[PDB]
Design an enzyme around this catalytic site. Sequence first.
Site, PDB file in Angstrom:
ATOM      1  N   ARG A 154       0.838  -1.165   0.000  1.00  0.00           N
ATOM      2  CA  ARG A 154       0.000   0.000   0.000  1.00  0.00           C
ATOM      3  C   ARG A 154       0.878   1.222   0.000  1.00  0.00           C
ATOM      4  NH1 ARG A 154      -2.433   2.432   5.533  1.00  0.00           N
ATOM      5  NH2 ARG A 154      -3.809   4.038   4.733  1.00  0.00           N
TER       6      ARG A 154
ATOM      7  N   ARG B  65      -5.013  17.413   7.167  1.00  0.00           N
ATOM      8  CA  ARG B  65      -3.676  16.919   7.471  1.00  0.00           C
ATOM      9  C   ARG B  65      -2.641  17.960   7.846  1.00  0.00           C
ATOM     10  NH1 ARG B  65      -3.601  11.028   6.308  1.00  0.00           N
ATOM     11  NH2 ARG B  65      -2.339  10.729   8.192  1.00  0.00           N
TER      12      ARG B  65
ATOM     13  N   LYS C 206     -12.921   2.617   2.012  1.00  0.00           N
ATOM     14  CA  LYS C 206     -12.579   2.612   3.425  1.00  0.00           C
ATOM     15  C   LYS C 206     -13.606   3.337   4.281  1.00  0.00           C
ATOM     16  CE  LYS C 206      -8.414   4.013   3.883  1.00  0.00           C
ATOM     17  NZ  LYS C 206      -7.233   4.900   3.965  1.00  0.00           N
TER      18      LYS C 206
ATOM     19  N   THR D 178      -5.289  -1.451  10.432  1.00  0.00           N
ATOM     20  CA  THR D 178      -4.856  -0.549  11.492  1.00  0.00           C
ATOM     21  C   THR D 178      -4.668  -0.994  12.948  1.00  0.00           C
ATOM     22  OG1 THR D 178      -5.387   1.242  10.009  1.00  0.00           O
ATOM     23  CG2 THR D 178      -5.007   1.823  12.338  1.00  0.00           C
TER      24      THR D 178
HETATM   25  N1  LIG Z   1       5.283   7.561   2.422  1.00  0.00           N
HETATM   26  C1  LIG Z   1       5.490   7.633   3.733  1.00  0.00           C
HETATM   27  N2  LIG Z   1       6.581   8.327   4.065  1.00  0.00           N
HETATM   28  C2  LIG Z   1       6.910   8.426   5.391  1.00  0.00           C
HETATM   29  N3  LIG Z   1       6.284   7.961   6.426  1.00  0.00           N
HETATM   30  C3  LIG Z   1       5.176   7.276   6.066  1.00  0.00           C
HETATM   31  C4  LIG Z   1       4.713   7.082   4.790  1.00  0.00           C
HETATM   32  N4  LIG Z   1       3.515   6.363   4.810  1.00  0.00           N
HETATM   33  C5  LIG Z   1       3.302   6.145   6.132  1.00  0.00           C
HETATM   34  N5  LIG Z   1       4.246   6.719   6.917  1.00  0.00           N
HETATM   35  C6  LIG Z   1       4.283   6.875   8.353  1.00  0.00           C
HETATM   36  O1  LIG Z   1       3.607   5.818   8.898  1.00  0.00           O
HETATM   37  C7  LIG Z   1       2.573   6.297   9.768  1.00  0.00           C
HETATM   38  C8  LIG Z   1       1.535   5.236   9.688  1.00  0.00           C
HETATM   39  O2  LIG Z   1       1.367   5.021   8.279  1.00  0.00           O
HETATM   40  P1  LIG Z   1      -0.176   5.193   7.598  1.00  0.00           P
HETATM   41  O3  LIG Z   1      -0.089   4.836   6.183  1.00  0.00           O
HETATM   42  O4  LIG Z   1      -1.077   4.255   8.308  1.00  0.00           O
HETATM   43  O5  LIG Z   1      -0.578   6.688   7.749  1.00  0.00           O
HETATM   44  P2  LIG Z   1      -1.671   7.479   8.687  1.00  0.00           P
HETATM   45  O6  LIG Z   1      -1.239   8.851   9.022  1.00  0.00           O
HETATM   46  O7  LIG Z   1      -2.138   6.721   9.882  1.00  0.00           O
HETATM   47  O8  LIG Z   1      -2.754   7.553   7.646  1.00  0.00           O
HETATM   48  P3  LIG Z   1      -4.068   6.440   7.357  1.00  0.00           P
HETATM   49  O9  LIG Z   1      -5.164   7.004   8.091  1.00  0.00           O
HETATM   50  O10 LIG Z   1      -4.258   6.822   6.040  1.00  0.00           O
HETATM   51  O11 LIG Z   1      -3.528   5.164   7.571  1.00  0.00           O
HETATM   52  C9  LIG Z   1       2.161   7.575   9.061  1.00  0.00           C
HETATM   53  O12 LIG Z   1       1.248   8.362   9.853  1.00  0.00           O
HETATM   54  C10 LIG Z   1       3.544   8.145   8.753  1.00  0.00           C
HETATM   55  O13 LIG Z   1       4.172   8.830   9.860  1.00  0.00           O
HETATM   56  O1  LIG Z   2      -6.623   4.662   6.700  1.00  0.00           O
HETATM   57  C1  LIG Z   2      -6.702   3.859   7.644  1.00  0.00           C
HETATM   58  O2  LIG Z   2      -6.363   2.658   7.681  1.00  0.00           O
HETATM   59  C2  LIG Z   2      -7.272   4.413   8.945  1.00  0.00           C
HETATM   60  O3  LIG Z   2      -7.579   5.617   8.912  1.00  0.00           O
HETATM   61  O4  LIG Z   2      -7.388   3.593   9.897  1.00  0.00           O
HETATM   62 MG   LIG Z   3      -7.300   6.478   7.176  1.00  0.00          MG
HETATM   63 MG   LIG Z   4      -2.568   4.551   9.444  1.00  0.00          MG
HETATM   64 NA    NA Z   5      -4.741   7.951   3.129  1.00  0.00          NA
END
Ligand SMILES: Nc1ncnc2c1ncn2[C@@H]1O[C@H](COP(=O)(O)OP(=O)(O)OP(=O)(O)O)[C@@H](O)[C@H]1O
Ligand SMILES: O=C([O-])C(=O)[O-]
Ligand SMILES: [Mg+2]
Ligand SMILES: [Mg+2]
Ligand code: NA
EC number: 2.7.1.40
Lengths: 519, 519, 519
Positions: free
Chosen positions: C61, C108, C258, C316
Amino acid sequence: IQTQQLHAAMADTFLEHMCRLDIDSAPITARNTGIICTIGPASRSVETLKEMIKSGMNVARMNFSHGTHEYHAETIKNVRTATESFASDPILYRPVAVALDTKGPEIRTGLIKGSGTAEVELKKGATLKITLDNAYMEKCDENILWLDYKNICKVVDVGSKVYVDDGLISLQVKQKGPDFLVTEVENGGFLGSKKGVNLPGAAVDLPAVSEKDIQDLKFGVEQDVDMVFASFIRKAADVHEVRKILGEKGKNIKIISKIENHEGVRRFDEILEASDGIMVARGDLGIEIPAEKVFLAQKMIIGRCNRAGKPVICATQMLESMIKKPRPTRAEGSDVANAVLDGADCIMLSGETAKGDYPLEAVRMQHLIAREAEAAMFHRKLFEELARSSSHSTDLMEAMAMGSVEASYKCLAAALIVLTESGRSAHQVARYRPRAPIIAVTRNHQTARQAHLYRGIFPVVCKDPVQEAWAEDVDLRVNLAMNVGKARGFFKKGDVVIVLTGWRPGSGFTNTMRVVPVP
Amino acid sequence: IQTQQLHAAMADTFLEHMCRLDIDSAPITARNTGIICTIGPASRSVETLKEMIKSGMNVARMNFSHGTHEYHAETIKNVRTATESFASDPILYRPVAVALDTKGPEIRTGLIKGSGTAEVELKKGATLKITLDNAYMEKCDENILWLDYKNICKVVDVGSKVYVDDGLISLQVKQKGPDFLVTEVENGGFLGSKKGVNLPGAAVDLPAVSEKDIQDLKFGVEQDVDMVFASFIRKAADVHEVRKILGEKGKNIKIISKIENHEGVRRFDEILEASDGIMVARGDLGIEIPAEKVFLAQKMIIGRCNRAGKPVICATQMLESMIKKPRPTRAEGSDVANAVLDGADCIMLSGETAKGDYPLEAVRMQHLIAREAEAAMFHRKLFEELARSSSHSTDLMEAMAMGSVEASYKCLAAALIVLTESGRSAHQVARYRPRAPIIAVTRNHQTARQAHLYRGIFPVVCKDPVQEAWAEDVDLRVNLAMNVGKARGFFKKGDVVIVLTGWRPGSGFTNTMRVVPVP
Amino acid sequence: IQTQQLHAAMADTFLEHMCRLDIDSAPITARNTGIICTIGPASRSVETLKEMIKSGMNVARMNFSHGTHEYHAETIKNVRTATESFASDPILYRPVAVALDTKGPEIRTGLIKGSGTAEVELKKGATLKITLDNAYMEKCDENILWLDYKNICKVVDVGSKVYVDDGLISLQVKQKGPDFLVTEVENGGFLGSKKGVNLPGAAVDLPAVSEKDIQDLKFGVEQDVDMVFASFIRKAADVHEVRKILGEKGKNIKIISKIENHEGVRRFDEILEASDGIMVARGDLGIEIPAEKVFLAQKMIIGRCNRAGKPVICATQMLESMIKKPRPTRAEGSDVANAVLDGADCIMLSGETAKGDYPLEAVRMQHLIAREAEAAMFHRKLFEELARSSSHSTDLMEAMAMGSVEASYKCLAAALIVLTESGRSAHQVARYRPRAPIIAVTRNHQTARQAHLYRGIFPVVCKDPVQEAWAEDVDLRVNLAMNVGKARGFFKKGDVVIVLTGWRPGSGFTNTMRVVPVP
Ligand SMILES: Nc1ncnc2c1ncn2[C@@H]1O[C@H](COP(=O)(O)OP(=O)(O)OP(=O)(O)O)[C@@H](O)[C@H]1O
Ligand SMILES: O=C([O-])C(=O)[O-]
Ligand SMILES: [Mg+2]
Ligand SMILES: [Mg+2]
Ligand code: NA
Ligand SMILES: Nc1ncnc2c1ncn2[C@@H]1O[C@H](COP(=O)(O)OP(=O)(O)OP(=O)(O)O)[C@@H](O)[C@H]1O
Ligand SMILES: O=C([O-])C(=O)[O-]
Ligand SMILES: O=C([O-])C(=O)[O-]
Ligand SMILES: [Mg+2]
Ligand SMILES: [Mg+2]
Ligand SMILES: [Mg+2]
Ligand code: NA
Ligand code: NA
């Protein structure tokens, strides 16, 4: 070797349940399924009536289809006379209901060659004209048939069948006028005078109650019957019509509707709602509808009534063979049992007791089979299915009923004692179908007699006055039931029993449930 | 309105399943339950036999308790004659199975006024002498009755009760003689020829296989029967001995053990294991044991064979009223429909077809009730219950069967087409009880005849010669089935069907399953 | 010798099934549940990619809420590199899906000190200023906190609470102006980059498909992503909108919606109906709704998709710990397990892989737990229920699937080989949840990649030319599976397999099912 199919009682699936049935597994003495016996020249006498009672007769049925008020009244007389013979022993006294079976609506042909005894022969393939022209009301013959039902052409369609003489003769409608039908003999035979007609698949406009009917019902009210078996019910309205005739004076009379034709089957739901109970009248039903469909309707009706908690009766030809023989056929034995397995509150005997050579044997027979079939039920699965069915309702009495049956199973109670006056309390339990007998003590004799309509209900009339202490009064009544089951052999001191009562005298229901020991 | 009780098919609960049975829900053309007819005086004729085939008979039953070898060989020819009369058309030919019914360890009466079809009327209250004097073995009458059992006197006592003809008549011993017994007719009745005698609660030590049994069996082999219905089987030993008498030559003949005594019920487990199949022999059974316990035995047995996957037959007195009347009783229609529901593979007709006044009717009626009961089954619970029971098994063909049935339910195919030589594959399908018709195409004649013992299997004789290419051969047979299905009205072009074939010649079983549309 | 909880697979009740789970009952080698890994800084490396795939990773992902098109494009690159690195031996080549996780209607924060990998500690009680001052956008820190939402000041009150990073940090608004927000930090914690803001219970008017969203969308289409995790989907309209932007070029890209808020939940059905599949985004979801209610959503949502036959993902904080620890917590191991038992087709890893210290360990841990949980499922009941649900349906491929699965259980097949190009036949099977592996052979790469979406499907890409002869061509493919199954250690010689194929080419589905032994 366990008793009462307890081994199969423990099965997980239906299949296992069956595979577990054991001929060597004895059943309890208590027979739950009510036995309705049609009284007649064979059973009318007091002596016999005494035997019928001894044999297991719970309900005496009055076929209003024939005989006079003067006759029936005499039968009722004897019945009452026979019942009371045991009253001397309040313990060994057994309530017997009285039912009135309506002649109901009818279609009849005319006289053959102005004679009541003459006959003609219809031949297959021939043409036969049905006329409504009373000019011929006594001039019936091989070519012309006159009938009673003035509105016939209105309810029958071209290509439909007309059955004469218990379906013995079948006719196919080829032409329709406003006054006659032109048919073609399919099923030939001899035609006598004044034979019955049946209009399979017809939505007949005959009145719910004949004039005769009205008269009999009023009679039944005056006679103080316990229920009425209403012939030819085809829709809710008809039930309402009957209700209306019995009126306020007979508002407490149980109306059982008889399902005897397509209509009745198709409009069963409304009919059920309007009725107090149902009777699967197989005789006509089998004439009306293809004989091969009867079972379907029988099980549909039984399930629906079980579901609604309404009494149901399986009747007709159960032990037919027995009119002449002391032992029935295998199919006969099968039929009674399946009936009971189906969920039928009561089973019935017509010809077998009314006129047959072995009335007592028929009764005994029914008694025998019902007991065995009774143990053979799959209670756990049943209770579970029922419960789901009724899940919509959060009624208190029902809750009381469910809780008490569940407990009787859990500790395998030997009985369930319910003190009721109206009998509602007791009805609620029966519907949840315990395996143990429901001994119900009431001071209301009619409630007592009517109890029979319900599976597992064993009425006990309290002939004592009221005590100043509720508590005491209750205890007493309970004890009564205790001496009975003992006297009957349902249990012995040491056995456990589920006791249902009203907390206080204005309780409204048996809100108090208790597990107790027999003295 | 949905067909084949499919609405009720969706029921979640059994209670519900029952409530949704609709008389207006039409069955399908295909009738799954095999109909077994006893052939006799009333049905021996070639003309007739042709009628019965058309009407639905699947198996011809010959009772060696009656008649003679020659009497029987003649009937056998007539059946075969009647049957082959259709062999012409390879699409309307109905394989018809032949079966021999043994005498076994039984007590039998003499001839009535020198006839095997004559009868006499007994009168309640009259005296009747049982004699061993071979001088009367053909001169039985209302005054004197000759028995098979020479020891009868030692095993009986004064006051003892002798039953004659599946309990029809009850004699009570009044006097013991060295050569006879002076009895008393306890009940009126018609005494016919060569009737069974049942001495409930009496030491009757007869052999599982008598010298006579030896001859009949060997005669049956010479007769090329397809199966033997083994009267009064009492232990697996009895069965083994029968297999032993049939030996190598009749190794492919099916042995059906007849349950008709306490011992046979009791040792049922060991009996089933050893048999090719079972018969619920209600006539004898119901007189041996308490009439009220029959249904139990009946049900236990059918669950057991169903569970076991071995063919079960319900029999006797099923349409009893029809021996004289052209319509059966209400208990009768029920019986038949409940036997089907119970899960019997075949149902049977005895007096009804052998000597009654309405042999073809009896047949068509069974046919009618059968298709109805079929649709009324609760296939989803059933299947589920079956799967479970055979859980411990992991068989490859079983697997193929269950997946086959399963998907047939799913897409609701019009039938299952099964290519089989041993018939093994087909059988395995029939045990999983699909709703649709199983059409089993085979080149093996006996297999095809033998198939009728299994529910829903409609055997098709492929008369074409083995194609040199597997594909074409397989295809060939399928087409054959496709054609019979169409012809027989089982399905039409566009309908969907489940096809079971071998991947390769000598695959061992149908390991190939496809869903195919009709052409 | 206990294996795969087969003993528990035989329990009658859900209770007994539980009561029978054995730690000593070893699971099979095949892991059914797909493993989705969030590719980040901590797992970008080809060398790291190689090991993760090796580790059990099926899908990557790429979170658009983080990074730039360029950072993600390289990641893809590396992903595909470490992948085909295994293209050497097509027996051991394992496809990997490429998933685009969208930004969406989200708030964000910005770059902590122009970093993004940079973190910051926030103390309790402290003060923090939320600003819209772009000149801070990339200069966040303990003191200053920039945000995406220029209206936030309008959508929040004083006293209110501002959530950062899935509720990690709670900020209470102390004072607000036009431009900024003045808050005191309520709980200490590491504040990172481009974090998530949850203004629970506040009217945010965000657009379903940002122009940026659009941007990314179009980007992934060029990227040739196999799927899309559409963030914050609230109603079917949003789907259509994403569907819209995907347009024609991506009419095949799977849209995975989602559910991360109260609306998404509430409008779940139509969402589901519109989307190709669903993810349970508990990170956002758990802050959007009460933490104590997520499991209700999860179960409702997983159940619904099961029912629908649509792929669902649990996502998550499953193995949160593991970002810093090599061993997860009790609670985390229960979570992955329970998710697998719930019905999730896939499981995800987020911080664990994208930035955690123990990427590899986390993965393997998912692998480990899944297997164990896959066995622990109650396949029997599940299958029945699954069928109860699909009952209206009569689809042909569905019937195949079912019968196939049914067969698979019966004969404990080692796998089911499906030959598909669209992949549907395989999904159809997957949906019926067999215990065994689905070896889905196809010549469609995208198909093979996307197969990871569905439970139990093991995608095998046939690289060989097409056979002129179907049979050979089919065979070959079957052979392919066999070899791979063998190489994977799914089965050995003599093992049984279920083979799903089409009779003819362009059969629209597998209509042919066969039971086979491994060669
Ligand atoms: N491309 C990336 N570059 C750097 N750090 C990343 C990247 N993708 C994820 N991370 C780090 O990992 C943490 C957890 O990853 P994640 O993809 O679950 O993001 P998130 O902020 O929780 O957003 P989501 O709600 O979309 O999952 C992020 O909040 C970020 O600090
Ligand atoms: O994007 C996700 O997985 C979340 O927000 O838990
Ligand atoms: Mg999310
Ligand atoms: Mg996340
Ligand atoms: Na996202
Ligand atoms: N081949 C036959 N010849 C003459 N009468 C026969 C013949 N087959 C049957 N019957 C008559 O029909 C009756 C019922 O037939 P069935 O075959 O059931 O005989 P059965 O006496 O009941 O004994 P079983 O217990 O063996 O079936 C017999 O009692 C006999 O009266
Ligand atoms: O009236 C009846 O009882 C009947 O028809 O069966
Ligand atoms: O022998 C028989 O078939 C019987 O007794 O039913
Ligand atoms: Mg009537
Ligand atoms: Mg017989
Ligand atoms: Mg017999
Ligand atoms: Na009447
Ligand atoms: Na015999």
